[PDB]
Amino acid sequence: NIQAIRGMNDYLPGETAIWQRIEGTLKNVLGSYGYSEIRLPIVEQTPLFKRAIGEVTDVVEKEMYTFEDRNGDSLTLRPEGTAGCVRAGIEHGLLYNQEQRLWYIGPMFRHERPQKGRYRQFHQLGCEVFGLQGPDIDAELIMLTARWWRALGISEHVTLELNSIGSLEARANYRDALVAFLYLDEESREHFAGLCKLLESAGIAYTVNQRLVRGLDYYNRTVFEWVTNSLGSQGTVCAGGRYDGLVEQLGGRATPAVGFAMGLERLVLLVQAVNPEFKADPVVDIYLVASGADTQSAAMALAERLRDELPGVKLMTNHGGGNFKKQFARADKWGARVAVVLGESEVANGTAVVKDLRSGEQTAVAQDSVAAHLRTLLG
Amino acid sequence: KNIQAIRGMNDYLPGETAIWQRIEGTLKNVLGSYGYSEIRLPIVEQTPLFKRAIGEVTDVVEKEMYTFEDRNGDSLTLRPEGTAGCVRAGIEHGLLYNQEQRLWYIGPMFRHERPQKGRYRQFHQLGCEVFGLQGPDIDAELIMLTARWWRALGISEHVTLELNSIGYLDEESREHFAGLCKLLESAGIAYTVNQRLVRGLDYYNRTVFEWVTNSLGSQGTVCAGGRYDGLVEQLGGRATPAVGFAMGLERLVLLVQAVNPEFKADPVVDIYLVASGADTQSAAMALAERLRDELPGVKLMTNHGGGNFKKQFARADKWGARVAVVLGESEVANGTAVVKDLRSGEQTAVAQDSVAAHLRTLLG
Numbered sequence: 001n002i003q004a005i006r007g008m009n010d011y012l013p014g015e016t017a018i019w020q021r022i023e024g025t026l027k028n029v030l031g032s033y034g035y036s037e038i039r040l041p042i043v044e045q046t047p048l049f050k051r052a053i054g055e056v057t058d059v060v061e062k063e064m065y066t067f068e069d070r071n072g073d074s075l076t077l078r079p080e081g082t083a084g085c086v087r088a089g090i091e092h093g094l095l096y097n098q099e100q101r102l103w104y105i106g107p108m109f110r111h112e113r114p115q116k117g118r119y120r121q122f123h124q125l126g127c128e129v130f131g132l133q134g135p136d137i138d139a140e141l142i143m144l145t146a147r148w149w150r151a152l153g154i155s156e157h158v159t160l161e162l163n164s165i166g167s168l169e170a171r172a173n174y175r176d177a178l179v180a181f182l183y184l185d186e187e188s189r190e191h192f193a194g195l196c197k198l199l200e201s202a203g204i205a206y207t208v209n210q211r212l213v214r215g216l217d218y219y220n221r222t223v224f225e226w227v228t229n230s231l232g233s234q235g236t237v238c239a240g241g242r243y244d245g246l247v248e249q250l251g252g253r254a255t256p257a258v259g260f261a262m263g264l265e266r267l268v269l270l271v272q273a274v275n276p277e278f279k280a281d282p283v284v285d286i287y288l289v290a291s292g293a294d295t296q297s298a299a300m301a302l303a304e305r306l307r308d309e310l311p312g313v314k315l316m317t318n319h320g321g322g323n324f325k326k327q328f329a330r331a332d333k334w335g336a337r338v339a340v341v342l343g344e345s346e347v348a349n350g351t352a353v354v355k356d357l358r359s360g361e362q363t364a365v366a367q368d369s370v371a372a373h374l375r376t377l378l379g
Numbered sequence: 380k381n382i383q384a385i386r387g388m389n390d391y392l393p394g395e396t397a398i399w400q401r402i403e404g405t406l407k408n409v410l411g412s413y414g415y416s417e418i419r420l421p422i423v424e425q426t427p428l429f430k431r432a433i434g435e436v437t438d439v440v441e442k443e444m445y446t447f448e449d450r451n452g453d454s455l456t457l458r459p460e461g462t463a464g465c466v467r468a469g470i471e472h473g474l475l476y477n478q479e480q481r482l483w484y485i486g487p488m489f490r491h492e493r494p495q496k497g498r499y500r501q502f503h504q505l506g507c508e509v510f511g512l513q514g515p516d517i518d519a520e521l522i523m524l525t526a527r528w529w530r531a532l533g534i535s536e537h538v539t540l541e542l543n544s545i546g547y548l549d550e551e552s553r554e555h556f557a558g559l560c561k562l563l564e565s566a567g568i569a570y571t572v573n574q575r576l577v578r579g580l581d582y583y584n585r586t587v588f589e590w591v592t593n594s595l596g597s598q599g600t601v602c603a604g605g606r607y608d609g610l611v612e613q614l615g616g617r618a619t620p621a622v623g624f625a626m627g628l629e630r631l632v633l634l635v636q637a638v639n640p641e642f643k644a645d646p647v648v649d650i651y652l653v654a655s656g657a658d659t660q661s662a663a664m665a666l667a668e669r670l671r672d673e674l675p676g677v678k679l680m681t682n683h684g685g686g687n688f689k690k691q692f693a694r695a696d697k698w699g700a701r702v703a704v705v706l707g708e709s710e711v712a713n714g715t716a717v718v719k720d721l722r723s724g725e726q727t728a729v730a731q732d733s734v735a736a737h738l739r740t741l742l743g
């Protein structure tokens with residue numbers, strides 16, 4: 001028997017439910033803003049990450065899952081999404097003289113030490129917006145993430161650390177001031193202050209971490225991250241910053257850009273920790289108990305009808321025999337509230353017993369009306 | 380220089396995503412109506428798994444896998460399918476032993492195939508598998524489910540159900556096939572037994588079926604699956620029966636878009652927040668935030684980075700904004716917000732506490 005590549009986990013039925021609830025909420029919020037999904041390929045040519053991310057980068061150096069295609073091309077399971085993004089953005093000319101506010105969701109691959117925060121295959125929801133210079137757009141991005149916390153009820157457990165790393169020149173003529181010892185540009189100071197203001201007015205509490213630089217070479221002015229001193233993830237749930245030059249660098253015309261990516265596992269962990277009781281929907285609403293002389297063909301028939309009469313309900317047609325007791329229990333296992341029982345009698349009588357699994361009260365109903373009775377019984 | 384996308388590995392721009400998501404949800408939703416639960420699996424697996432499960436003699440294992448050697452010399456492979464990975468995690472977490480599990484999963488698969496019609500290197504599959512059920516009943520349920528999917532997409536009148544048993548069939552397999560062939564007849568599902576229908580994998584056993592479309596929505600095939608009772612044992616766990624199918628989303632999306640060019644999705648924006656003048660923006664985002672709580676479910680985009688009214692008005696059009704909540708200095712000092720209906724052009728000055736109501740009325 002084979003196992004799962006250490007650091008690359010599975011999300012089982014029960015865990016899945018919660019992940020989908022949190023995801024929807026997140027997507028929904030992105031919709032409330034005008035943001036559109038963008039779907040990018042899991043692997044890209046290795047030179048991309050090299051060029052985009054940076055050579056000296058610890059990511060490039062020892063975290064990438066590179067390899068070779070049957071044609072000698074150096075391929076790489078993506079470590080992030082911005083690069084793949086800017087790449088297709090230029091590839092299909094969506095960024096030239098255009099505004100685009102998008103988000104993507106999917107896996108990323110990094111070769112790191114499996115931990116609580118870290119995984120070898122992790123999931124990111126991240127969003128980028130191209131075309132907007134001023135701080136105003138940066139502020140909207142923060143506000144977006146702010147809304148997210150508010151919606152998950154973990155607003156009380158994330159802090160905004162914020163910082164500006166100026167431009168190339170400032171970072172260029174900074175080697176002296178740092179390494180010798182071993183200083184910002186005006187337009188970047190103003191742009192940062194203007195953002196610091198928009199937040200202040202917005203009523204969003206930030207903290208300027210003078211020593212906050214991110215792990216990628218494409219960032220430029222704004223740099224920020226959302227951290228939980230609740231150790232939901234590794235500490236940082238969401239992080240991101242500006243990167244005006246990357247579009248040009250990757251071969252397209254210059255346009256401004258800004259974004260952030262968030263660790264879904266950290267998020268999901270935080271939510272489940274700070275909101276101890278946050279269960280999402282049950283897996284099965286009604287479980288169709290059915291037995292006797294040729295029931296089944298009829299039982300699935302009743303079931304299909306009940307699904308059209310009751311859209312939105314989760315109904316599971318029992319299967320492969322099982323005495324009443326067996327099925328009732330299977331019903332419970334799934335967390336069915338009601339059970340539409342169905343013996344031969346009920347079949348000949350054009351009926352279907354409806355048993356309320358909560359109180360046990362079972363009353364015979366006519367098929368055409370069972371839908372109505374369940375609709376009330378459930379809500 | 381510019382990097383391009385790995386041939387056979389394509390992106391889905393904003394435009395096409397809207398439609399992809401509408402289609403996905405319907406499918407998802409339908410899976411939910413039946414009791415099926417999702418299971419999320421890893422993109423890469425240990426190569427032996429695909430060898431062992433899929434088959435050594437399989438054209439798949441031979442020249443199609445995206446295998447590579449991890450830093451630790453371990454042979455890794457980018458999944459060509461999900462079943463193996465599924466059964467795998469199934470055994471791994473002890474979900475299959477003496478249990479019934481009805482699940483589905485959705486994500487990318489990879490195969491090194493020389494670039495064709497409905498054949499990519501990275502493609503997407505929605506598939507589902509249920510473990511624990513012997514009888515033809517369960518198989519029947521699975522066909523019924525796919526049938527409902529076509530019905531909901533409006534492509535029912537464009538998929539044919541090819542069916543076959545692959546054990547010259549032994550007693551048990553014959554009775555099992557017949558019993559299903561009937562469940563179908565009774566259910567009113569029209570099938571065609573293709574006596575020459577064998578799948579490409581080595582784990583299948585009796586039922587072997589596929590949904591085919593003549594306009595070439597899929598690579599002819601949209602959906603395909605069959606049984607595989609022994610694979611749980613083969614891969615190292617106690618024997619239990621199993622059945623499933625996987626569907627090619629690019630094919631399906633292609634088909635739905637062909638069989639009904641009508642189908643599109645909600646536009647990008649509902650309300651586009653026009654705004655300009657002496658210090659507006661800080662205030663403008665303030666209103667916008669408010670309107671979002673008052674109007675949940677509505678897609679509202681706050682214009683950014685200058686632009687004269689005309690400019691902002693056209694951008695609102697680009698998005699397909701129905702209304703525009705304009706907001707100059709006056710509106711600000713007056714506690715108001717001009718509500719313009721981009722359809723008629725009729726703009727009325729409304730009080731902010733009331734804008735929500737007007738918009739709600741204006742949209743639906």
Ligand SMILES: Nc1ncnc2c1ncn2[C@@H]1O[C@H](COP(=O)(O)OP(=O)(O)OP(=O)(O)O)[C@@H](O)[C@H]1O
Pocket residue numbers: 080110112117118119120121122123124214215233234235236237238239240261262263265266
């Ligand atoms: N291996 C991983 N497992 C889980 N989450 C991760 C992993 N790598 C990155 N993330 C998450 O993705 C976000 C965006 O990636 P980013 O490049 O900012 O990470 P980072 O700078 O390496 O930070 P960290 O040290 O927390 O991994 C991170 O803030 C974190 O929440």
Ligand SMILES: Nc1ncnc2c1ncn2[C@@H]1O[C@H](COP(=O)(O)OP(=O)(O)OP(=O)(O)O)[C@@H](O)[C@H]1O
Pocket residue numbers: 460490492497498499500501502503504579597598600601602603604625626627628629630
């Ligand atoms: N490379 C691909 N690109 C797009 N869709 C694919 C690709 N490979 C498979 N599919 C889709 O996935 C379904 C299930 O694939 P499965 O692994 O059962 O068989 P297959 O070997 O892909 O057969 P087929 O040649 O008919 O696609 C197919 O019927 C098809 O719709």
Ligand SMILES: N[C@H](CO)Cc1c[nH]c[nH+]1
Pocket residue numbers: 079080081082126127128239240241242243258259260261
């Ligand atoms: N992809 C980055 C980290 O993984 C986060 C981000 C996106 N755009 C700008 N910053």
Ligand SMILES: N[C@H](CO)Cc1c[nH]c[nH+]1
Pocket residue numbers: 459460461462463504506507508603604605622623624625
């Ligand atoms: N495993 C193939 C693609 O993932 C098709 C399938 C699923 N279940 C049974 N057959």
